[PDB]
Design an enzyme around this catalytic site. Structure first.
Site, PDB file in Angstrom:
ATOM      1  N   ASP A 130     106.834  60.615 136.112  1.00  0.00           N
ATOM      2  CA  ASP A 130     107.310  61.941 136.518  1.00  0.00           C
ATOM      3  C   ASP A 130     107.627  62.864 135.338  1.00  0.00           C
ATOM      4  O   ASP A 130     108.520  63.709 135.438  1.00  0.00           O
ATOM      5  CB  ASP A 130     108.546  61.842 137.427  1.00  0.00           C
ATOM      6  CG  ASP A 130     108.190  61.467 138.844  1.00  0.00           C
ATOM      7  OD1 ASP A 130     106.997  61.552 139.192  1.00  0.00           O
ATOM      8  OD2 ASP A 130     109.103  61.074 139.604  1.00  0.00           O
ATOM      9  N   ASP A 138     113.402  65.061 133.074  1.00  0.00           N
ATOM     10  CA  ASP A 138     114.031  64.360 134.189  1.00  0.00           C
ATOM     11  C   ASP A 138     114.035  62.845 133.959  1.00  0.00           C
ATOM     12  O   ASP A 138     113.818  62.062 134.889  1.00  0.00           O
ATOM     13  CB  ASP A 138     113.346  64.720 135.513  1.00  0.00           C
ATOM     14  CG  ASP A 138     114.153  64.299 136.731  1.00  0.00           C
ATOM     15  OD1 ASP A 138     115.381  64.091 136.605  1.00  0.00           O
ATOM     16  OD2 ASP A 138     113.561  64.174 137.819  1.00  0.00           O
ATOM     17  N   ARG A 179     115.821  56.118 137.904  1.00  0.00           N
ATOM     18  CA  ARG A 179     114.934  56.273 139.053  1.00  0.00           C
ATOM     19  C   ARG A 179     113.532  56.706 138.639  1.00  0.00           C
ATOM     20  O   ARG A 179     112.600  56.615 139.447  1.00  0.00           O
ATOM     21  CB  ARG A 179     115.513  57.290 140.046  1.00  0.00           C
ATOM     22  CG  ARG A 179     115.676  58.690 139.448  1.00  0.00           C
ATOM     23  CD  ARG A 179     116.478  59.641 140.360  1.00  0.00           C
ATOM     24  NE  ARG A 179     116.494  60.996 139.811  1.00  0.00           N
ATOM     25  CZ  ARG A 179     117.386  61.445 138.939  1.00  0.00           C
ATOM     26  NH1 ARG A 179     118.429  60.716 138.572  1.00  0.00           N
ATOM     27  NH2 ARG A 179     117.220  62.650 138.408  1.00  0.00           N
ATOM     28  N   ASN A 180     113.355  57.199 137.414  1.00  0.00           N
ATOM     29  CA  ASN A 180     112.024  57.573 136.944  1.00  0.00           C
ATOM     30  C   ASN A 180     111.482  56.605 135.912  1.00  0.00           C
ATOM     31  O   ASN A 180     110.663  56.995 135.076  1.00  0.00           O
ATOM     32  CB  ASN A 180     112.028  58.988 136.387  1.00  0.00           C
ATOM     33  CG  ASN A 180     112.024  59.996 137.478  1.00  0.00           C
ATOM     34  OD1 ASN A 180     111.367  59.786 138.501  1.00  0.00           O
ATOM     35  ND2 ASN A 180     112.780  61.078 137.304  1.00  0.00           N
TER      36      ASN A 180
HETATM   37  N1  ANP Z   1     103.699  55.208 141.567  1.00  0.00           N
HETATM   38  C1  ANP Z   1     104.701  54.742 142.332  1.00  0.00           C
HETATM   39  N2  ANP Z   1     104.634  53.524 142.890  1.00  0.00           N
HETATM   40  C2  ANP Z   1     105.626  53.046 143.656  1.00  0.00           C
HETATM   41  N3  ANP Z   1     106.748  53.717 143.929  1.00  0.00           N
HETATM   42  C3  ANP Z   1     106.947  54.953 143.434  1.00  0.00           C
HETATM   43  C4  ANP Z   1     105.912  55.549 142.589  1.00  0.00           C
HETATM   44  N4  ANP Z   1     106.356  56.763 142.240  1.00  0.00           N
HETATM   45  C5  ANP Z   1     107.570  56.931 142.807  1.00  0.00           C
HETATM   46  N5  ANP Z   1     107.918  55.853 143.521  1.00  0.00           N
HETATM   47  C6  ANP Z   1     109.176  55.687 144.277  1.00  0.00           C
HETATM   48  O1  ANP Z   1     109.341  56.761 145.204  1.00  0.00           O
HETATM   49  C7  ANP Z   1     110.585  57.416 144.992  1.00  0.00           C
HETATM   50  C8  ANP Z   1     110.421  58.916 145.137  1.00  0.00           C
HETATM   51  O2  ANP Z   1     110.157  59.448 143.849  1.00  0.00           O
HETATM   52  P1  ANP Z   1     110.516  60.970 143.544  1.00  0.00           P
HETATM   53  O3  ANP Z   1     110.066  61.778 144.725  1.00  0.00           O
HETATM   54  O4  ANP Z   1     110.033  61.296 142.167  1.00  0.00           O
HETATM   55  O5  ANP Z   1     112.114  60.955 143.558  1.00  0.00           O
HETATM   56  P2  ANP Z   1     113.000  60.277 142.413  1.00  0.00           P
HETATM   57  O6  ANP Z   1     112.134  59.998 141.215  1.00  0.00           O
HETATM   58  O7  ANP Z   1     113.738  59.149 143.053  1.00  0.00           O
HETATM   59  N6  ANP Z   1     114.181  61.467 141.988  1.00  0.00           N
HETATM   60  P3  ANP Z   1     113.705  62.872 141.091  1.00  0.00           P
HETATM   61  O8  ANP Z   1     114.165  62.524 139.713  1.00  0.00           O
HETATM   62  O9  ANP Z   1     114.499  63.970 141.723  1.00  0.00           O
HETATM   63  O10 ANP Z   1     112.232  63.025 141.271  1.00  0.00           O
HETATM   64  C9  ANP Z   1     111.030  57.042 143.590  1.00  0.00           C
HETATM   65  O11 ANP Z   1     112.448  56.905 143.492  1.00  0.00           O
HETATM   66  C10 ANP Z   1     110.334  55.735 143.310  1.00  0.00           C
HETATM   67  O12 ANP Z   1     111.214  54.651 143.556  1.00  0.00           O
HETATM   68 MG    MG Z   2     110.459  60.554 140.514  1.00  0.00          MG
END
Ligand code: ANP
Ligand code: MG
Ligand code: ANP
Ligand code: MG
Lengths: 299, 295
Positions: free
Chosen positions: A153, A135, A139-140
Site C-alpha cells: 500500500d 501510511d 496493518r500494511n
Molecule cells: N494482497 C493481499 N493479500 C491478502 N490480504 C490483503 C492484501 N492486501 C490487503 N489485505 C488485507 O485486507 C485488509 C484491507 O486492506 P486496506 O483496505 O488497505 O486497509 P488497511 O491496510 O487495513 N488500513 P489503511 O492503512 O487505512 O489502508 C488489510 O488490512 C489486509 O489485512
Molecule cells: Mg492497506
C-alpha cells in the site's frame, strides 16, 4: 508497460471482501486467463475516489508496478474501466498486525527482530526509489510466510481515516511527508509488533496526539523490550526529523540485535520459539515462496 | 536430508481426486501448518498397495526424489508414511501437458511446441547428469506450471515399485533394460505426442504386439505439422541400437535451434495468429504462479 498488466473486467471476478481501509476495499478474487480453464487466486483493491484522468493513474501505477524488492509488494495489474481496481498477489496469511495478535503466545525474539529488519529493508528500498509511503503501519505489512513479510500500500495516499497515531508530528501539523516521517511510522510499527498488536495511545483521541507529542510524551516501553530496543523507537519519534535514524541505519542495528536476540527482548519460553528448521524452511519456500532468504540467525 | 519433509497425517487433507495411474491416485489437498489458520493447496500422490520395512527403502528413494533441483523437473517436497505412502508435491492447476495439448488442439503455435521440447530435454539432461533414469517419461508425465514453463514429473516412481509399453524402448520391453538411452526413446514418443496434439501412439495395435512391429522396423508416423528435420530427430530416438540414439544434450541444441526459427520446422495452419507470450503477459504469469529461477 511490461511490468503492469492491463486487465479486462471480463477476466477477473471478485469473490469475498477481505477488508477495508482509508483507500478502498480489498477482495479475494480470481483471475481466469483467456482461453484457459484455470482460476488463479488474486487480491483486488478497489479504490475509493478522491479526481484525476485515467492516463495519470496509469502513470502512477507503472511506478507501483516497478518496485523490485523481496520486502515490498509489487502492483501486478490494473483495471480502469469503471472504478480503479488494482491486482496484486494474494497473501493468505493476511497482515502482520493480525498475525502478531493471533500468535502473541508463540512469537519469539528471532521472529520479532527479523521482521523489524525486513520492514526496514523494504522501506530503505522505497527511499532509494524516492518513494514516500505515507501510511506505513503493522496493518500494511503483509505476511508472505511467517519468515517473510512485505510492505504494501505505498503511495496509495499519493494517488488519492487519517492514521494520526502513526504520523510524524510535522505530518500532523504541516502535512509534510518525507522518508524521515516514514521513519516515525516505522517506530510505531515496531511498537505494534513488540506489544503483540496493541493499539497505540489507546483511549486517547486523535485530536490530542499533537499536544501530547509536544509535551514530550511518547508510547511506553513494551514489557518485552530491553532499553536498547526502546531507545531505537524513541529516536524514531524525535521532533527533529533529521535527528531520526535512517532506514539503512535501522537495518544494521536490528540485524546486529537479531544475532543475539535474547539479549534484546525478554520473552518467556523464548528458547523454544526459534526460526524453522532447514527442513521446514525448505518446505515453506517450495510451496509458498519460491522468490531472498537472508534471515539473520542467532550466534 | 533437509530437502524431504516428513508430514503428520493430521497436517493435510484430501479435497478432490485429480486422476490415477499405474502407481496411485493423485489428489488435490490442503496443507494446514500447525497452529496456523491458512489452507495451502498441495498435490498428494497416494500410492496403491499398503506398505513397514519397505518404508525405509521408500524413504531412501524419497530423499533422492526430493533432491532434484532443476526448473524443468518436479521435486518431491514431503512424504507421509501411513498404511498407504502419501507423497506431497507442488500443485499444478494447469495439469499435464498431454491434456493441455488436446484441449488447445490446433490452437497451439510452433514457438510453444518447440520450447516445450527444449524444456523437457533440459529436464531429462539434468537427470542424466544425476545418473537418474526416469523410466516413465510420457506427455502425461510432463506438468504445465504455466503455458510457458513445463516440468517433468513422476521421476523415481517406477523404480519405487501396466508397463507403459508404447513409450518403452525395445530393449526395455524385451529385457527390462532401462538406461538414459531408453529414456531418449520415450522422449521421442513424448515429442510425437506433442506434435500430434495428443494422439495415442500405435492406436489400434495391441500392446503385446508392439515389440514385434518395432523389430520389423515400424515406427510412429510423421505428424502432419512436422517437417523432415523434426521427424528425423524423433526417428533417431527410436533406433534399435541405443548408443546411436541422440543424447539429451544434443536434443537441447537441436530443438533450441529450431525454436529460434519455429515456422521453418513446424507447418501449422494459423501459426501467424496463434499467440506467443508478450513480456507483459509473461511477467504477470510469473508473479502470480511461477517465481522460480527459469522456464
Ligand atoms: N494482497 C493481499 N493479500 C491478502 N490480504 C490483503 C492484501 N492486501 C490487503 N489485505 C488485507 O485486507 C485488509 C484491507 O486492506 P486496506 O483496505 O488497505 O486497509 P488497511 O491496510 O487495513 N488500513 P489503511 O492503512 O487505512 O489502508 C488489510 O488490512 C489486509 O489485512
Ligand atoms: Mg492497506
Ligand atoms: N503435481 C500435480 N499437480 C496437478 N496434477 C497432477 C500433479 N501430479 C499429477 N497430476 C495429475 O494427476 C493425474 C494422475 O497422475 P498419475 O497417477 O501420475 O497418472 P498418469 O500420470 O496419468 N500415468 P502414470 O504417471 O504413467 O502412472 C494425472 O492427470 C496427472 O496430470
Ligand atoms: Mg504421472
Amino acid at each position: 508497460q511490461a511490468l503492469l498488466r492491463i486487465l479486462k473486467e471480463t477476466e477477473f471476478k471478485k469473490i469475498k471482501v477481505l477488508g477495508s481501509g482509508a483507500f478502498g476495499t480489498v477482495y479475494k478474487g480470481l483471475w481466469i486467463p483467456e482461453g484457459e480453464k484455470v482460476k488463479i487466486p488474486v487480491a483486488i483493491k478497489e479504490l475509493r475516489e478522491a479526481p484525476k484522468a485515467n492516463k495519470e493513474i496509469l502513470d502512477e501505477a507503472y511506478v507501483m508496478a516497478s518496485v523490485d524488492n523481496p520486502h515490498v509488494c509489487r502492483l501486478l495489474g490494473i483495471c480502469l474501466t469503471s472504478t480503479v481496481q488494482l491486482i496484486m498477489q494474494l497473501m493468505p496469511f493476511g497482515c502482520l498486525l493480525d498475525y502478531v495478535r493471533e500468535h502473541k503466545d508463540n512469537i519469539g525474539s528471532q521472529y520479532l527482530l527479523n521482521w523489524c529488519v525486513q520492514i526496514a529493508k523494504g522501506m530503505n528500498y522505497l527511499e532509494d526509489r524516492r518513494l514516500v509511503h505515507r501510511d506505513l503501519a503493522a496493518r500494511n505489512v503483509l505476511v508472505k510466510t511467517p519468515q517473510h513479510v512485505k510492505i504494501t500500500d505505498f503511495g496509495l495516499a499519493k494517488l488519492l481515516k487519517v492514521p494520526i497515531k502513526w504520523m510524524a508530528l510535522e505530518s500532523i501539523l504541516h502535512r509534510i511527508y518525507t522518508h524521515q516521517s516514514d521513519v516515525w511510522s516505522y517506530g510505531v510499527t515496531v511498537w505494534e509488533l513488540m506489544t503483540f498488536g496493541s493499539k497505540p495511545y489507546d483511549g486517547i483521541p486523535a485530536s490530542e496526539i499533537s499536544s501530547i507529542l509536544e509535551k514530550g510524551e511518547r508510547l511506553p516501553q513494551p514489557p518485552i523490550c530491553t532499553i536498547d530496543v526502546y531507545m531505537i523507537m524513541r529516536k524514531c519519534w524525535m521532533i527533529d526529523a533529521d535527528s531520526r535514524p535512517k532506514f539503512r541505519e535501522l537495518i544494521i542495528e536490528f540485524s546486529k540485535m537479531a544475532r543475539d536476540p535474547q539479549r534484546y527482548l525478554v520473552i518467556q519460553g523464548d528458547e523454544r520459539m526459534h526460526l524453522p528448521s532447514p527442513t521446514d524452511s525448505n518446505f515453506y519456500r517450495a510451496l509458498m515462496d519460491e522468490e531472498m532468504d537472508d534471515v539473520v540467525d542467532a550466534d
